[PDB]
Symmetry: D2
Subunit: 120 residues, 4 copies
């Protein structure tokens, strides 16, 4: 299932536990950006997905502050878990930095990450 250790296409490490109540908890270690070591993540997933072959919807957030760095920013990943021989979590993400109002127009980056249980 969702619980386990996942890697995105750039080598970031996503260590997640999916709880009975729909909770996602764990740590994220980024391979890019103003980041170093692990950061806390929390999120939610559908704990009773459809039974028609559909994926399992989920999302989570990392605020890029830990005991060693603070980038004044946060990423959310929104996506779905797809089971099978090679399980996969396909996501799109938004990375918002704290800005002044005049700079808010350039506050948010967008991209897509795919996660598997093997290193890229």
């Amino acid at each position: 299932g969702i619980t386990g250790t996942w890697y995105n296409q750039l080598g970031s490490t996503f260590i997640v536990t999916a709880g009975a109540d729909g909770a996602l908890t764990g740590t994220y270690e980024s391979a890019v950006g103003n980041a170093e070591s692990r950061y806390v993540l929390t999120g939610r997933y559908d704990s009773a997905p459809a039974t028609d072959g559909s994926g399992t919807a989920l999302g989570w957030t990392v605020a890029w502050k830990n005991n060693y760095r603070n980038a004044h920013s946060a990423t959310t990943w929104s996506g779905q878990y797809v089971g099978g021989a090679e399980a996969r979590i396909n996501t799109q993400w938004l990375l918002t930095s704290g800005t002044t109002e005049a700079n808010a127009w350039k506050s948010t980056l967008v991209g897509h990450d795919t996660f598997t249980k093997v290193k890229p």
Copy 2:
């Protein structure tokens, strides 16, 4: 300044506690108990003090004890304090789909939250 009740532009209500460890926890009501859902997320607990906003994000999975849309929304944005405080966000809403329908699985939009209705 984040902890409390917030209201978006379309009649939703966003109730949150910002914990000392960077946690966001609370409930989201998209319109009674049938419409309330758990939310969890994170925020920058040590933001800059130069006029910049406070970065944050949270997730709602659209399942409760009454309904299940097989979908989840993430909001990514920043809190801005002051007399007219706001949380300005962009969001992604992914539905569980088959592989053939995955290309149309994700909606995008934006929400602005205020402390007054």
Copy 3:
């Protein structure tokens, strides 16, 4: 209709002509970023919208190169025109910069612009 001079919430100026064949042409002047004076835009719109009260879908692109500056980037706006007492074009946009592969993960900003024929 769509043809006219529009302004977004930051004061950018969008001068557009909607042709009978579905073509959008005109110029864009940005209130923000590495930009000066007018830039070419081209795009498309639905020349036969639904008759059920729905808006009119459209989109356009600006490459941020003109005779004065070149930011090595391009924005696309995707949205719909909504007729009314206060006509409005509501959009969401993607701004992609030319980058190296190592920097591609942070190549794309995302936002939302609303345009009116009155400058806010």
Copy 4:
């Protein structure tokens, strides 16, 4: 390097001409290529990109109306072209449908497409 036929990961095809002035013009279609699947495309690209190894920024729009059908929607692709023997156009896209105001919150889909010169 942009002018020619490109294929995405899901069976769509587009033929584009990159003009000297920065114009993109052409047609977007399905793998089958039947007339009912073909739509006009129009966009812009950076006609003087950097020389430091960066990609070439571009974007284009397709409104999903042709002589045969009308989905009352339009997609914009925003991305960069990367040349070489394994040339690519890497994009993210937004697909907005015309909606009433009550339904505008769910008017816009987002995704990503990768285009290659080979099927």
